[PDB]
RNA sequence: AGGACCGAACCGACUAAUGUCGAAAAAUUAGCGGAUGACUUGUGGCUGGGGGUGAAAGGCCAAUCAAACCGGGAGAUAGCU
RNA sequence: GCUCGCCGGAAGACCAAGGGUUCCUGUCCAACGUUAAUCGGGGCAGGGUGAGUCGACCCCUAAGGCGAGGCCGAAAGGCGUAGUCGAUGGGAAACAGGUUAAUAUUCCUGUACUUGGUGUUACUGCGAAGGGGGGACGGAGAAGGCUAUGUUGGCCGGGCGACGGUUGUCCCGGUUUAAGCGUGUAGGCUGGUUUUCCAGGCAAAUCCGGAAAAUCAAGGCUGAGGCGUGAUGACGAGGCACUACGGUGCUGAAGCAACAAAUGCCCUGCUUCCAGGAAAAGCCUCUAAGCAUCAGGUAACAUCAAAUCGUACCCCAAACCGACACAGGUGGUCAGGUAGAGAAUACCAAGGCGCUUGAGAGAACUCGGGUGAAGGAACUAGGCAAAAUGGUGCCGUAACUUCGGGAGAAGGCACGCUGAUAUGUAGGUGAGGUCCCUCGCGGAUGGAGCUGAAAUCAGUCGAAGAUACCAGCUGGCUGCAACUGUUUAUUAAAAACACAGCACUGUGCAAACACGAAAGUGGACGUAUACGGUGUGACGCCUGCCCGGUGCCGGGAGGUUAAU
């Protein structure tokens, strides 16, 4: 749910929270945590490498389960829960033999339904089975690349891949981006699309919020100097020169995909 | 106002101090250029 | 077991002074200068062994040295152990 | 509840005078701004010279910065004093 | 030595960091100290640092460093796995009193406490580089329960007054007591026990997790404080013997209550919020291979062990960082009185200092201040500086507005003290008594004592009652930037930078991109509701035409064109 803020102080004024009532207000279950240590974009040469990463409240590492092996064993989501790493909420998951599990939340799970993976498991949103056996036309979401690897295509938290043709061992995966791309017919997907499709509804307010979600501010071209960005320097606005980022490459609009690898899978690039 | 050197003990001796001199190959000619002038206090050790 | 040799090399020497005499006299501890690096049980065995007395037990400390100025040059005389060796009730000593 | 409000510690540095062979190689005094936060602080790490870092001033990197310091090429070169 | 003055959320009392003997006694003052110096942080000599319990080492890990092999690199070397280090963090145990010229949770007295090794007996399956639990955690807010501590009465001891009065509701001082052990409450969390199995916890498990059944309805975890004991002891106002006229020696009275009360403890709680809040061992528990009269585990008693290093002194400073005995800088902890909302501020207590040149005179001039006739910004670049305003309660309060504001708008009015309401009220606190009781650290009653606002009414004093200190100047029109913020350490704090938002664009994941000859890393343990770049800069109304030029994107017929 979408909820304004009363303007009692400016900062307060242009902010929208986004709340779940059936959430969990309390402590996630303890043995699917992991530490999280922040870099702040900086690589193990100790420079920054992307900027504008740094600061923001302390995360723990929720474990998801993506590759989803659990094969056959019917599941009952027990719980709802919020998730710092990423934008999609998860679900906390108890197998029938007693064996718990997170995984991404399907939009229509709350308190108490019941999953089942694997090639068996019935075509209802949030159970998994492989692309060679969901009908064609569906919607997926967390689809594998690789047999067996992990969710990788559209686990965000607004996000779905719509299976349009299945020709042989390869099925055409119309992408979230607008991509179709064949990714092998044997890889994983979980029907129905991802939980927070509002996510893409709040509005952050104030600096503060950015800066509690730990990124940085971003001092733009046209303020440094002619030493540190191309477009720097100039007595007041001066901006006579094609964008380009501050490595000296174009920026509005130039191409930049160049891995071969892989341009047989691209079906057709978005547009 | 808050002068330059604020001393350490634990930060000097690992910065400066004697096995940090000889871990790297440069450090080890800092103690063989000291060696060679003569120097009585080789490193900042005690 | 501690050997004679070493039991020998422990203590150097007695201590003189208004602390030592009035510990002495008052709560029945001697206090002895000893070798750098020898220990506490070290010390009580070798001064029952040399002694032929009964100790209680033995707190030791390191003295620290003394800078001093002999004309322009500056030197450390050294830093040495002090041990109080607290003697059980009743025993006398020369 | 709040990058809400008044205001001490803490943090800052707007104005004025004094000082400018100073008490001090930037401070004092009288006022002044923030003061639950994009805050402040202790300890210990990490990033380095055309390189670091930078809420961007060409500022900061040991009282040094449009390219630090030290040693060397080196008694560079000086149609100039 | 007596007065005086200054500090008193410090200029006091403990430490960390850092120095290193500066600490204490004796002697000396040539130099050092901005003067003399018999003095000193100066010179010389002697002394002084005592630990099972404090800190370190140690056990454990974070960031990070190093890193067998390994991968990579002209060489030097770069990264990194197993590992191993790394406290700013987690892990055993001690307090009171006395004593030194100088040390003390370290010595002395009294009373404790933990962890091993070893021994003797009683029962028992023990067993890990493995499984599980625990350790284990955010911000804000809210009270409740208490304590440290404080005020008054009581008790005990002393006093009865240099000048009018002071045996009385008068005056001064004291009224202290710990760890541990025992009981184990206010509060907080959780329904218990047994049976039967289950593809989960990279093997097993009797542990954890799961599913069904009975089943009594309560048990357990946790926990400040209080109360006992510790303690017919230590301490204790003072008296008196003693003087090296230092301060020593010897006895020693009362030692309780009521009320107020933390920023501390219960509380790593509880409520709530999103920004979603370390790891590892010690600890408990499970077994695997394995040993299975043994070994080992548990309980009991006795026993041995607790090594080593630091411990003086300074520590908002004359000792540390600043060339100085320098008006600067520097982290933690302790927190009395009256007034006050308060750690503000004024005055004070304990405690510490009067700042290492003085003595005169009382010109100009400079500095820091006090006051001022009449005028009141005429000064001036400019109300710069100064002056003024200043508190609580109530009354009232405009344009505009994003409907929160603007607003403490503006503007007033009341404020002292004494009596009465009311021999100090509403309130808070709560003994005794009585009653029921699952008898207690319980509950209902009950109101003595204590504490105590705020208001009304009457009087009264002053020129003035928020009397000092402290403590908004206000209003109108307009530029720019939405805003809090950040910036040129050391002449610029702004309209610059940032910003939430906006849009274009790149990026399909071995992502774009950055760092790096490379390996590898960051991006990201993310995945298009995502990340990078660039411009703009909340919000409201908006964002027009131009593709010639330049860049970008797309296209491939044709012409031109490299190596070969
Ligand atoms: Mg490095
Ligand atoms: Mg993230
Ligand atoms: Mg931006
Ligand atoms: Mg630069
Ligand atoms: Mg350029
Ligand atoms: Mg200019
Ligand atoms: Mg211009
Ligand atoms: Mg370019
Ligand atoms: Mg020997
Ligand atoms: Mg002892
Ligand atoms: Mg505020
Ligand atoms: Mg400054
Ligand atoms: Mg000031
Ligand atoms: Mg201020
Ligand atoms: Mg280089
Ligand atoms: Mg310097
Ligand atoms: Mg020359
Ligand atoms: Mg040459
Ligand atoms: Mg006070
Ligand atoms: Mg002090
Ligand atoms: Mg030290
Ligand atoms: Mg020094
Ligand atoms: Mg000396
Ligand atoms: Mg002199
Ligand atoms: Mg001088
Ligand atoms: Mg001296
Ligand atoms: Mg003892
Ligand atoms: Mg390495
Ligand atoms: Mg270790
Ligand atoms: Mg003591
Ligand atoms: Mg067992
Ligand atoms: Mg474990
Ligand atoms: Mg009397
Ligand atoms: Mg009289
Ligand atoms: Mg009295
Ligand atoms: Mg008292
Ligand atoms: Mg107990
Ligand atoms: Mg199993
Ligand atoms: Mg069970
Ligand atoms: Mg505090
Ligand atoms: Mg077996
Ligand atoms: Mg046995
Ligand atoms: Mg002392
Ligand atoms: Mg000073
Ligand atoms: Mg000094
Ligand atoms: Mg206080
Ligand atoms: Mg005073
Ligand atoms: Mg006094
Ligand atoms: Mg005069
Ligand atoms: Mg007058
Ligand atoms: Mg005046
Ligand atoms: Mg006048
Ligand atoms: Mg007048
Ligand atoms: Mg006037
Ligand atoms: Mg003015
Ligand atoms: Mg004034
Ligand atoms: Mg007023
Ligand atoms: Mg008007
Ligand atoms: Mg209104
Ligand atoms: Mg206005
Ligand atoms: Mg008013
Ligand atoms: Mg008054
Ligand atoms: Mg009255
Ligand atoms: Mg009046
Ligand atoms: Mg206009
Ligand atoms: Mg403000
Ligand atoms: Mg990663
Ligand atoms: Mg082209």
Not at chain 1, 56 to 64: L, N
Not at chain 1, 192 to 204: D, I, K
């Amino acid at each position: 749910a979408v909820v304004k803020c009363k303007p009692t102080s400016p900062g307060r004024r242009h902010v929208v929270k986004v709340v779940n009532p059936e959430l969990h207000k309390g402590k996630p279950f303890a043995p699917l945590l992991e530490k999280n240590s922040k870099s702040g974009g900086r690589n193990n040469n100790g420079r920054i490498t992307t900027r504008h990463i740094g600061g923001g409240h302390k995360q723990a590492y929720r474990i998801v389960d993506f590759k989803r092996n659990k094969d056959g064993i019917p599941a009952v989501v027990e719980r709802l829960e919020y998730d710092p790493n990423r934008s999609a909420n998860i679900a906390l998951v108890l197998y029938k033999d007693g064996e718990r599990r997170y995984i991404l939340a399907p939009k229509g799970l709350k308190a108490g339904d019941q999953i089942q993976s694997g090639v068996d498991a019935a075509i209802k949103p949030g159970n998994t089975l492989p692309m060679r056996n969901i009908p064609v036309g569906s919607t997926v979401h967390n689809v594998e690349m690789k047999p067996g690897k992990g969710g990788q295509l559209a686990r965000s938290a607004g996000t779905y891949v719509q299976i349009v043709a299945r020709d042989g061992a390869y099925v055409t995966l119309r992408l979230r981006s607008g991509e179709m791309r064949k990714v092998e017919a044997d890889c994983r997907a979980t029907l129905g699309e991802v939980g927070n499709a509002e996510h893409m509804l709040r509005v952050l307010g104030k600096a503060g919020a950015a800066r509690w979600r730990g990124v940085r501010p971003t001092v733009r071209g046209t303020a440094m100097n002619p030493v540190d960005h191309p477009h720097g320097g100039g007595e007041g606005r001066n901006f006579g020169k094609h964008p380009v980022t501050p490595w000296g490459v174009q920026t509005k609009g130039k191409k930049t995909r160049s891995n071969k690898r892989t341009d047989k899978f691209i079906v057709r690039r978005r547009s | 106002m808050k002068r330059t050197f604020q001393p350490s003990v634990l930060k000097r001796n690992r910065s400066h101090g004697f096995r940090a001199r000889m871990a790297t190959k440069n450090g080890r000619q800092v103690l063989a250029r000291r060696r060679a002038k003569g120097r009585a206090r080789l490193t900042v050790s005690k | 077991m501690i050997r004679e040799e070493r039991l020998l090399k422990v203590l150097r020497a007695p201590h003189v002074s208004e602390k030592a005499s009035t510990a002495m006299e008052k709560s029945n501890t001697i206090v002895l200068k000893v070798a750098k690096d020898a220990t506490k049980a070290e010390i009580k065995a070798a001064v029952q062994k040399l002694f032929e007395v009964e100790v209680e037990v033995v707190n030791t400390l390191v003295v620290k040295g003394k800078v001093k100025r002999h004309g322009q040059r500056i030197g450390r005389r050294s830093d040495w152990k002090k041990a109080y060796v607290t003697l059980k009730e009743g025993q006398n000593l020369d």
